[PDB]
Design a protein around this ligand. Structure first.
Ligand SMILES: *CC(=O)N1CC2(C1)CN(S(=O)(=O)c1ccc(Br)cc1)CCO2
Ligand SMILES: *CC(=O)N1CC2(C1)CN(S(=O)(=O)c1ccc(Br)cc1)CCO2
Ligand SMILES: [Cl-]
Ligand SMILES: [Cl-]
Ligand SMILES: [Mg+2]
Ligand SMILES: [Mg+2]
Ligand SMILES: [Mg+2]
Ligand SMILES: [Mg+2]
Lengths: 231, 10, 231, 10
């Protein structure tokens, strides 16, 4: 691709510069080029990939929600709101397709860290979930099942291989519970998953890691917030 | 008010 | 161009939706397509054009400043910082070239409102100034003179045709004084212009317009802030 | 701290 002539280490370096400059589309392009070199990504590099694409798709979701709300209130006079919502929607789907293609073609493997395997399967569940936020037809069922399957496989690994305070395990369970509540229309599943995750992290709080405990305690607070919202 | 998912960090 | 098949009114409508969705690159594309229809823009439509491109170029300037500062501190080891700074710089120049081409090809005219004539010449001075922030060589002199000439022509018209509280006249003088202080290395010219502008707006404060007085008083406060910084 | 130019509005 466009990044094929650049050295891997230069791509990582430039992804970090782009983060500093808040140029997240650039930083995602740099990290996509890094992934396409075909070597595994370290934890720090997975964070770069994650931050870039989450920033890009987050702006698209935010835009799509604004336009969709305008579109729904105007359905209570021309084609313009729908066409522009469809435009942003198509771009969002393209970014999710790009991320999911990278996960399938390069990143999701049988080997490697529990951390890496759980994180990428979590990523796959998330980007299927973002596709499901804008899906409607026969696609929507296919996409919702794909999200669940990826989340569930990540959950199985994290529960076997990871302490209950691990921030990837926590963030996965947080995002799966959001899937249950907002996408799958299964509230009770979401409260029970979120409560089980919080309580189990709390019961084994001594497993907090000194290089990540701030991340763990952030996610357990977000679990509590969702539980307070949902109850 | 929607649910809160995992945020960006670091 | 890409917007050529869309009706002007739909382009305006979509520029407004894109503003609401904070999709400023889209909103600039929509307004560029509107301008290319070859009709004049109203005040409200000039605001849309202005907001879109200022948001786009503002993000580029902010990114360029981050990278340039990293580049300067690393000059006190590879090519990556310079190459990526050059990348963002080229994109910024392309947006300024696009705006300046629109001004020259479509918008700057002998006829029309004082408001429109002053605003577009102000715009031309601004985007030459943004080019001058990143220029270096023989280009830099050419660009600095182009900015000054456009600002000065806008100043001449605004002083003849506009009350001293008019927000376009005020914003022009504010931006010209910034040009003097930050670009042309003429501090004294900048304080004297900013002080003359503030004091003259204040002397004829009764000329504030009831549909724009909030904009006027904002710019006179920004004149005061710059004067406090510069003294 | 740089100088302040005209801001976006409306
Ligand atoms: C070490 C490793 O693989 N990673 C990926 C991560 C660090 C964590 N993930 S995440 O989505 O699991 C996450 C957990 C906790 C928080 Br507060 C935020 C995100 C994001 C990328 O970096
Ligand atoms: C009526 C008209 O032509 N316009 C253009 C504007 C409304 C004003 N300009 S500006 O750069 O002159 C400006 C003045 C005052 C403030 Br607080 C902000 C901007 C911006 C576009 O809209
Ligand atoms: Cl569109
Ligand atoms: Cl580059
Ligand atoms: Mg390489
Ligand atoms: Mg669709
Ligand atoms: Mg038309
Ligand atoms: Mg150059």
């Amino acid at each position: 691709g466009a990044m094929g002539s650049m050295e891997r280490a230069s791509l990582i370096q430039k992804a970090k510069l782009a983060e500093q400059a808040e140029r997240y589309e650039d930083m995602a392009a740099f990290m996509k080029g890094a992934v396409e070199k075909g070597e595994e990504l370290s934890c720090e590099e997975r964070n770069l990939l994650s931050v870039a694409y989450k920033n890009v798709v987050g702006g698209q979701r935010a835009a799509w929600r604004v336009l969709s709300s305008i579109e729904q209130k105007s359905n209570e006079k021309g084609p313009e709101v729908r066409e522009y919502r469809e435009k942003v929607e198509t771009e969002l789907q393209g970014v999710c397709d790009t991320v999911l293609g990278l996960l399938d073609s390069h990143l999701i493997k049988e080997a490697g860290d529990a951390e890496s395997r759980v994180f990428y399967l979590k990523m796959k569940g998330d980007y299927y979930r973002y596709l499901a936020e804008v899906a409607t037809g026969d696609d929507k069922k296919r996409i919702i099942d794909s999200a669940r399957s990826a989340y569930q496989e990540a959950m199985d690994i994290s529960k076997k291989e990871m302490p209950p305070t691990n921030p990837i395990r926590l963030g996965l369970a947080l995002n799966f519970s959001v899937f249950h509540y907002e996408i799958a229309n299964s509230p009770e599943e979401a409260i029970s998953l979120a409560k089980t995750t919080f309580d189990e992290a709390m019961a084994d709080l001594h497993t907090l890691s000194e290089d990540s405990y701030k991340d763990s305690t952030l996610i357990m607070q977000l679990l509590r917030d969702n539980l307070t919202l949902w109850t | 008010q929607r649910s809160t998912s995992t945020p960006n960090v670091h």
